[PDB]
Each structure stands twice: as structure tokens, then as C-alpha cells.
Structure 1
Amino acid sequence: TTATRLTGWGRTAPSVANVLRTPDAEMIVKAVARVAESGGGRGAIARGLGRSYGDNAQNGGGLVIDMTPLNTIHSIDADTKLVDIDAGVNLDQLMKAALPFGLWVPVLPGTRQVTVGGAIACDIHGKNHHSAGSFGNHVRSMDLLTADGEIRHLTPTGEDAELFWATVGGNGLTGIIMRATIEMTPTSTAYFIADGDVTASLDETIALHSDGSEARYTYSSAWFDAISAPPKLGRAAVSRGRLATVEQLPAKLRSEPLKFDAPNKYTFGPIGELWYRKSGTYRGKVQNLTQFYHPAGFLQYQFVIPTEAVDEFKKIIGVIQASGHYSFLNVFKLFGPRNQAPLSFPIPGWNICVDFPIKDGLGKFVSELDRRVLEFGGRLYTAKDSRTTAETFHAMYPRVDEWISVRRKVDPLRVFASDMARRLELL
């Protein structure tokens, strides 16, 4: 163990905790079982690759278990479509291993550098949520080290389904995931057929997302403008598509379908708008995973607003543009059907990712966004959150009492605690 000053991805809210780095799973149990012997506050929390901007992976004055050295891939089956990996396997290595099997990772996020454990405990969502769902929708099994010292096999529709769905999106507060079984998406190739569209306004962006085009694509997301004033506010470059098949690939890349090949004055004028429009408009473009998907002093803010709340979603975008806080990196998506995890972030609706530069009055401004998001029936993402209040969060997640009841039953001693847990009063 080493006392380290660790952080979320946001470089924010430093906390000092004793970190454990061991590949011995049995060793991991000893420390957890030792903490219950200490029978006191400052519990233990698991940690993946620290890609969450929040304080969900730190436990100040407590214990942190870095799960990254448990990166053994046990089995991959192309017939069953099942992989079996330890919770410290990252999604980049898992993808690499599975492509030769004709398999694809069911849910991939913006970054590839996330653990299986991290992917489950934040129930990560991706460019394909509307066609595939969250990461938890694909976990066919997982083994969880609970507070009692026991390791419990968990299943989605099994007898222990309650504790399963509480661990899905449960920010590691149910226990430490050790090993999981994930059903993969079958794939003919490692390429994408891509379809591109450019919009001129927020209305035209929303129109395209509710006209029915979404049905044609399994993957969908868009870069959007949040600086320009109406009507240009909300204009977007949309990138949509699906996993390609061999026959769809050009013959020169038919060789190895499952290969992962390694990587003015007009601009603002009417011709610039026209040039950008045609260059952003394309049909059936064959692309790499890099080309399609993965092309400190900031604060990333992510919220979703229920689908039917179209106008109140348009209102909050107008607010952000009006506030004088300028965000350039903006991701727009329309989530499909939510799952049955109480603490799951995604619900069907209008997902926004904004990235604000830290400056005077931002903390207070985003507290006013928290207010509107909550008011318009939406929620925030624990993975992105470092500074919302417990009260605001509890109201955003109506099933929070349902989740806490599970966590109280499985971990009454409060063996598993984190900075977030205390902040959002989930213990």
C-alpha cells in the first residue's frame, strides 16, 4: 500500500488515500476483510483507470484498490459470443482480443481506456445506446466481492438479480467486481459504413433526430454549436452508421475484414456554410473505428432531458449560450430505452455534453443548470459529476431509496465508501 494523492479525470478535488496495487485476487480479499475487522469509517473503494471526472473513484483517508493489475482474459467464445474477463481488463485490450473471433464490444464510450469494472459500475453508454443500450444490458454474469468477505455470482435474470442491478451503475458501492461475463455483438468486420449530415439550427437538429432516420442507424451522435446566437445556436455535424459486412467493404480491404489498421475568407461566409455542409454530408462512407468513433482547467457537464420535453430542452440550450460561458466541445445524442438499474444514468431523451472553461461565476451557473435539468425531469452523470449536491441528485434519481435499501442490506458496516458516496449521501 502507498499513500497517494489521487484524483478524477477533471484534475479537481484532490483526496489522499492508501492505494493497493496487487494482481493477487486473494490478497485483495484480505485487505477488504481486514477493513471490516477495523469495523470503522473511511472504507474501501475499487478503482479502474481513473477516467471518471468525479470523486467516485477516490476515498480520502480511506482505502483505494487499483484493479488494473487484474487484466487476465480467461475465455472468449465465438459460438456463444461470450467473453470472460477479470474486472481490470480495459476495453481497448478486450476489443483487440475479440476482433479475431468476429466479435465486437457491445458498448464503447468516447475513450477506450476504461476497465470492465468501470464500465459496469458507471453503466457506461455510447454512440449506439438507442440501438444497443447501456453496458449493463450485456453483462450476462459477474462475480462480486461483498462486504462479508464472500464472493457472490450475480446474474441479470437470476435469483440475485436485485444485487446485480444495484451493482450496475452502482459506482462500486455494492462491492468490488472481480470477474465478469459479457455477451459481445457479432461482427463480420472491424469497419463502419458511415452517413453524414449537417444542420443549420437547433430545430433542424431536433427534426432530424425525431423524423425517424435514427431507425436506419445503430450508431449516432453529433458535434453541436453552443456559442453562436439563434438561429445558428444548435447547428450540428451529425455522424451516423452501422458495423459493416465483408461484401460492403472494398475488395482491397476484403483481405482482412477484422483487421485494426493503426492510424480563409470563405469560411464564415455563405460559401463557407455551403462548403461545410457538403463536406459534412456523405453517404455510405467506409471508415476505421478511429475515423468513425475515436477521431484540467475545464469542467465537463453532462445531462439528459426526457424525449417529450423538447421545448424545455431547447430552453436550457438557449440558457447556456446566453450565460457567456463558451463551450466548444459539445456532444449531442438521443438515448433510446433505459434499463432496470435504479442508479442508471441514461433514460430516453436528449443527451448533451458541454465543456466549460473554469472562470468566475461558473460554479454558481452550473448550480442553476442542475436546477433546470432536475426541473425538466432529467439527471446528471455520476462519472462526470464532482460538485452537485446530495439533495439535487436524490431528486434526479427517484429510485434512490430503492438502491440505498439494497446497499444497506449488502454493506451495513459501510465497508465500501467513496468521496462521492459521502457527498451524495448514498451510504
Structure 2
Amino acid sequence: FPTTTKRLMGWGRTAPTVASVLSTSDPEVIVRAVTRAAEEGGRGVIARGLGRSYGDNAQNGGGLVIDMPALNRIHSIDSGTRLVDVDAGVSLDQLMKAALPHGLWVPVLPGTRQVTVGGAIGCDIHGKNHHSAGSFGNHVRSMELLTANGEVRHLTPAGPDSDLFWATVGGNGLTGIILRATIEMTPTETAYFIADGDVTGSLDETIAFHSDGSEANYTYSSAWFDAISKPPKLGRAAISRGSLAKLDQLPSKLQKDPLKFYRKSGTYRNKVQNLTQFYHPLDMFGEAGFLQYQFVVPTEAVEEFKSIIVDIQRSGHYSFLNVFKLFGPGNQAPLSFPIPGWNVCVDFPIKAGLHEFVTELDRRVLEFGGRLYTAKDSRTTAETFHAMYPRIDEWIRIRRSVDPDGVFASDMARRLQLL
């Protein structure tokens, strides 16, 4: 085993640990890494992708961490079936580039493309198109999961160990190492969006804006809101909504290569945009000076959702950067973050009182029927987490089925009692 010793941290740059990291482009060397741990039984193993998760789910202090990005080969891309067969360490960035010439679009994109296929599945990631496309797990056809008995299992969403499939989706790697997957891509005639922009003047307008049925006219939607001004301005937002452009909707110059790659206001229509124009401000979150916090509360819990936003602004913890989105229906994964409702990611300068205020937020999110997102948590308690996810015991049951001895472990699994 080629291993080096590395100090590791998540994107939040908090709670670093040291571990042994194995990188290899050979799946075989990883299967062997697993069996020598299913015998050693020290602190366990965890996969790590590109480490874009904020907290501590992709590290294992004094354990073994597998550097999955080294295992980044694309096996095949088929315009016909729309299927793409990929090592788990392939970037969505790498994948999008390889797939674009074939008229194929990564079906769920987060705000950064430096995420592996494996981490996308591990956190069941969502994008601006959640209300139309659900989360990344919804698009997975199969995965090969290396389990603690050193076996590589072929898993599918409906099929024999379907429950295992769904506990892996959003399982934060605690089910075993995903080595390879087949994703069903989205067909596109173009690499561009056609987008509408709008600005609201308050929280209540922001909410009404999302609640008229409008969202059905766009496959992609999100908003950046003001969380610093006092009502009536609190919650005013710049909304950006769009769908992938068809070839006949581009200007002729872009119609040349369609699969490539007055004051400017937040108000505009039928504007042609590429991915990075269209995805602002979602890309710029992690640039430990800042604590990110993301929650969703159910659609019906409107006054309760507004009350969170009101309290944030009263607290004096100022988040300049954020995101607001209305999620659509969730999937079958027991620990998948998204449920229908109001989703917000906020970004607070760390200072006296922050951690305590966010504990207060947790209790409210929890009280209102909502949850926190593991990809963005460095911080919450095991007890709150378990209460936010009513299917957690079911998931722990599956988890133990497949790793009775605790071969797969992370700092997060300890912190949140997932083992």
C-alpha cells in the first residue's frame, strides 16, 4: 500500500485530523485496503472525494482514508441510452466536459463542479433544478459498492439490495466505498440556459414569488436574498430561473458551437447564459473565517420559516452570501437531505456567540419539521441530527447489516453517532 500521512480538513477548514491516505488508480489496491482493515479492525476506513464537504464526513482521524480522485476514469458515454459509466473519483467537471460533445448534461449540478461522482452520491447532492429533477441519487442507475467483507456489490435503485442502494445514497460513505457507477444523463441540444431574472422587495414577496405555480415554468431556480437589512427589506431577493436552451433559441454565433465548454439589473428575460453566469452566487461559498449553515423547513411551515430569517437578521450575525430555493419532492434514501420546502444556506463570519445561535437555529429547524444537510455540517449534535431524520434507525440497521464490525468510519459518524 502506497500511503502517505496527511493532515485532512473539510471545506470549512475546521477540526483537522491526521490519517493515512491511500491513493491508487487501481480498484484492486482499494479492495485489498479494505480486507486488511476488516482484519486489523483499527479506526476504520473512509472514502474521500475532492473534499468539498464542509465538515468532517470524509476524514477518519488515525484511520485509513482512500483518495478516490486518483480513480477517475470514464469507462463509457452513450448518447443512445444516455448512460455514462464512471469511476467514483471522476469530477462532475471532468464528466461534464467529456459528456457535452455527446449532447449530454450532468443531471444534477451543485454550485461547484469539483465534486466526485462518489461524493455526489455520498451526500445525495442537489442543485438549482431540485424541484424538477430531484437530487443526484435519483439519476443513479447502478453503483459498485465495495463492502466491509471485501465484496464488490452491484446495486440498483429497484433490484435486490435496493435498501442498501438507498442507504448509500446520502450515506456519507458509511456503507462502503463506491468504486464505479452508471449515471443516467440528461439530453440537451445545448450547453446554455435561457434565463429570467427578477427582484423582490421583501421576504413576503420572495415567498409569494415562489408560491404562485411559477416554478413549474423553469427546470432551474434559485435566489440570493438580503439577510442583513431590517424588515421590510429583509428577505428581498434576486431570483434567477431558467431552463437549458434548445438549439433554435440561441443566437447564430452560439448556434455555431452549441455544446461548447443602461444598467445591468436583476430583472431580465429570455437571457442566454452559460453554466457559470447562470449559477452565480452558488460557486463562491467557501472563499475557518465563515461558518456555513444549510437547512430546509417544510413548505407549509411558512411563518416558522420566516421566523428563522427574521431571527438571523436580529441576531447581528451577518450573512452577505446565501441561497434560497424551493425544493420539490424527496427520494427514498433514509438520510437524503432534501424534503419539499424552503431551503436556505447562509454564511456567517465566526465570532462570539455564533455557535450558540446556530444551536438555537437547530432547535427551531428541528421543531418545525426540518433538517440540516451533512455536506455543510461541521457542528450539530448527534441528538439533534437523529431527531431531524426520522428514518435514521432504519438506516443504522442497514448500515450495520453490511459493516457489522465498523470497518467504515469517519469523524462525522463518531460525532453524530452513525456507527
TM-score (norm 2): 0.97
Asked if 1:281 corresponds to 2:273, the answer is no
Asked if 1:300 corresponds to 2:289, the answer is no
Contact 1:325 1:357 (C-alpha < 8 Å) held by counterparts:
yes
Correspondence for 1:32 among 7, 31, 34: 34
Q: Distance in 2 between matches of 1:24 and 1:250?
A: 45
Q: Which moved more, 1:12-21 or 1:293-302?
A: 293-302
Q: What's the CA shift for 1:155?
A: 0.3
Q: 1:220: which partner in 2?
A: 221
Q: Distance in 1 between matches of 2:348 and 2:274?
A: 30
SS in 2 for 1:286: strand
Q: 2:276: which partner in 1?
A: 290
Report the residue type matching 1:280 in the other structure. Answer: G
Asked if 1:373 corresponds to 2:365, the answer is yes
Q: 1:266: which partner in 2?
A: none
Q: 1:343: which partner in 2?
A: 335
Q: Distance in 2 between matches of 1:252 and 1:48?
A: 38
Correspondence for 1:416 among 399, 404, 408: 408
Q: Distance in 1 between matches of 2:167 and 2:191?
A: 33
Asked if 1:76 corresponds to 2:77, the answer is yes
Q: What's the CA shift for 1:294?
A: 4.9
Cα RMSD for the two superposed structures: 1.0
Q: Deviations over 1:71-129 (max 9, x none)?
A: 10001000100000000000001000000110000000011100000000100000000
Contact 1:41 1:414 (C-alpha < 8 Å) held by counterparts:
no
Contact 1:111 1:294 (C-alpha < 8 Å) held by counterparts:
no
Q: Distance in 2 between matches of 1:251 and 1:411?
A: 56
Q: 1:354: which partner in 2?
A: 346
SS in 2 for 1:125: coil
1:171-250 matched pairs, under 5 angstroms: 171-250=172-251
Cα 1:294/1:224, change in 2 over 3 Å: closer
Report the residue type matching 2:157 in the other structure. Answer: P
Q: 1:268: which partner in 2?
A: none
Q: Distance in 2 between matches of 1:147 and 1:395?
A: 28
SS in 2 for 1:325: coil
Q: Distance in 1 between matches of 2:201 and 2:178?
A: 46
Q: Distance in 1 between matches of 2:388 and 2:221?
A: 26
Q: 2:7: which partner in 1?
A: 5
Q: Distance in 1 between matches of 2:363 and 2:159?
A: 38
Q: How many residues align?
A: 411
1:374-393 matched pairs, under 5 angstroms: 374-393=366-385
Q: Distance in 2 between matches of 1:336 and 1:209?
A: 12
Q: 1:256: which partner in 2?
A: 257
Q: Deviations over 1:119-167 (max 9, x none)?
A: 0010000000000000000000100000001000000011110100000
Q: Distance in 2 between matches of 1:424 and 1:34?
A: 26
SS in 1 for 2:375: coil
Q: 2:285: which partner in 1?
A: none
SS in 1 for 2:75: strand
SS in 2 for 1:363: helix
Correspondence for 2:319 among 323, 327, 334: 327
1:4-23 matched pairs, under 5 angstroms: 4-23=6-25
Report the residue type matching 2:227 in the other structure. Answer: A
Q: Distance in 2 between matches of 1:94 and 1:34?
A: 32
Report the residue type matching 1:113 in the other structure. Answer: Q
Q: Deviations over 1:228-287 (max 9, x none)?
A: 000100000000000001100011211111112xxxxxxxxxxxxxx98x8111010011
Q: Distance in 1 between matches of 2:257 and 2:290?
A: 41
Asked if 1:318 corresponds to 2:310, the answer is yes
State the identity as a percent.
Answer: 83
TM-score (norm 1): 0.95
SS in 1 for 2:222: strand
Q: Which moved more, 1:285-294 or 1:240-249?
A: 285-294
Q: 2:51: which partner in 1?
A: 50
SS in 2 for 1:344: coil
Write out the 4+ residue segments of structure 1 that deviate beyond 6 Å after TM superposition. none
Structure 1 unaligned regions, length at least 5: 261-274
Q: What's the CA shift for 1:41?
A: 3.8
Q: 1:265: which partner in 2?
A: none
Asked if 1:158 corresponds to 2:144, the answer is no
Report the residue type matching 1:28 in the other structure. Answer: I
Q: What's the CA shift for 1:322?
A: 0.5
SS in 1 for 2:374: coil
Structure 2 unaligned regions, length at least 5: 282-287
Q: Which moved more, 1:19-28 or 1:116-125?
A: 19-28
Q: Distance in 2 between matches of 1:251 and 1:61?
A: 57
Q: What's the CA shift for 1:21?
A: 1.0
